[PDB]
């Protein structure tokens, strides 16, 4: 058997890749797909069997580049591998931004800052910060102010004009190609707590 020709891959939905090829001349019993993450050795590769000239790679990482090749087998054993084909998976909404850190500037001013989500699952393009008054049981008493940060590299926010000795709830969430992820939360009273960050 020769090598399967015309290796062809494309992202298909969540965490999976559709991979097909042109069968080699003859009557192959099946194929063996070898796939791995671009940058990893063909030693961390996974091996899939198929009886048909296509395969679904599942359980993959979001927004991740994958390399793959395929070989055919039959009566006379395994044949050569196809040429390499590279393909990137679709994106997923990000995880929570990192825990929130507060630099108290005054009884009415604070510098909120957060880390990038541990799993971006894509290219992060914005952050949204909500903050608002909460009562004694720590639930908002009114509409939360919403702030769009259109520069994802800016993970710091100077919020001034807050009320003295008043508890405020703060949330940060990230957005990427797939949309918005879950929120990271913290309740902070400025009066309660110099230039060293606080972290609930």
């Amino acid at each position: 058997l020769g090598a399967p020709q015309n290796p062809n891959a494309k992202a298909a939905g969540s965490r999976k890749i559709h991979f097909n090829w042109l069968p080699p001349s003859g009557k192959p019993m099946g194929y063996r797909v070898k796939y791995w993450i671009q940058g990893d050795s063909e030693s961390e590769a996974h091996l899939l069997d198929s009886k048909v000239p296509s395969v679904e790679l599942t359980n993959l990482y979001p927004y991740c580049d994958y390399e793959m090749k395929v070989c055919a087998y039959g009566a006379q054993g395994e044949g050569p591998y196809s040429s390499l084909v590279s393909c990137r998976t679709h994106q997923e909404v990000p995880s929570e931004p990192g825990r929130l850190a507060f630099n108290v500037v005054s009884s009415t001013v604070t510098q909120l800052s957060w880390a990038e989500p541990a799993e971006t699952n894509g290219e992060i393009t914005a952050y949204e910060v909500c903050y608002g008054l909460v009562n004694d049981d720590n639930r908002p008493i009114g509409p939360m102010k919403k702030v769009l940060v259109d520069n994802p590299k800016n993970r710091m926010l100077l919020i001034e004009n807050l009320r003295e000795s008043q508890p405020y709830r703060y949330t940060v969430k990230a957005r990427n190609g797939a949309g918005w992820g879950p929120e990271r939360e913290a309740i902070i009273n400025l009066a309660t707590q110099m230039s060293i960050p606080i972290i609930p």
């Binding site: 990192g98 825990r99 500037v105 510098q111 880390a115 989500p117 590299k153 926010l157 919020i159 001034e160």
Partner: protein, 231 residues
């Protein structure tokens, strides 16, 4: 009501970056964004290797598990060197929390550059900072009208910077003209001279110092590096 991150954090970030690069180039390394180029841990490790001359392990990986491992190496090195790193976790640096990252670098600067200050008639109850201020005051003593009360407003007009360099090498500075020049002119002159004649890296831009309230940590880092360039 929200506003733009404080200008002082912009300047502190630039100061800390120029400082980190000053050392990293010794190892043929260079960071571009302080809030990104330290997340994988490799640069922190290299920075520490250069600063202490020690040799540190490296978990060579590609994923997050390995980032965290590498950063932990850096943090552990500091903690074993009795450097208190409070409220700072490895994932905080690996995931790039900007304030905490700033803090880590400040800590590093304190421990390696600012803490080894030595002034005549000092006390071990004096902080590294208090010793640096004492030093500055001793250097500009006698210079008419010159006075060093803090590491912020006191440096705004550039005159202390010039006087300090003058005390060390009178031939480099024309104090007469310093008394007649603008804050910017003086600042620039000082930074320029210190760089070309004392090999003191230009951590600060004049426009970033000529302000009502300069970034204290940035001033401190620079003043400390003047001290380093002097016996």
């Amino acid at each position: 009501v929200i506003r733009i991150a404080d200008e002082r954090d912009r300047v502190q970030k630039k100061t800390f970056t120029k400082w980190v690069n000053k050392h990293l180039i010794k190892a043929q390394r260079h960071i571009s964004d302080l809030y990104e180029d330290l997340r994988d841990g490799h640069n922190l490790i290299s920075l520490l290797e250069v600063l202490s001359g020690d040799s540190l392990p490296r978990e060579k990986g590609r994923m997050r598990f390995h980032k965290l491992q590498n950063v932990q190496i850096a943090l552990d090195y500091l903690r074993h060197r009795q450097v208190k790193l409070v409220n700072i976790r490895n994932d905080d640096i690996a995931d790039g929390n900007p304030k905490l990252t700033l803090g880590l670098i400040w800590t590093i600067i304190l421990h390696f550059q600012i803490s080894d200050i030595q002034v005549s008639g000092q006390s071990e109850d004096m902080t590294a900072k208090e010793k640096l201020l004492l030093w500055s005051q001793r250097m500009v003593e006698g210079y008419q009208g010159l006075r060093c009360d803090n590491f912020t407003s006191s440096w705004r007009d550039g005159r202390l910077f010039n006087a300090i360099i003058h005390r060390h090498k009178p031939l480099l500075i024309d104090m007469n003209k310093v008394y007649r020049q603008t804050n910017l002119e003086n600042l620039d002159q000082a930074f320029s001279v210190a760089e070309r004649d004392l090999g003191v890296t230009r951590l600060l831009d004049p426009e970033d110092v000529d302000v009502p309230q300069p970034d204290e940590k940035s001033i401190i880092t620079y003043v400390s590096s003047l001290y380093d360039a002097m016996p």
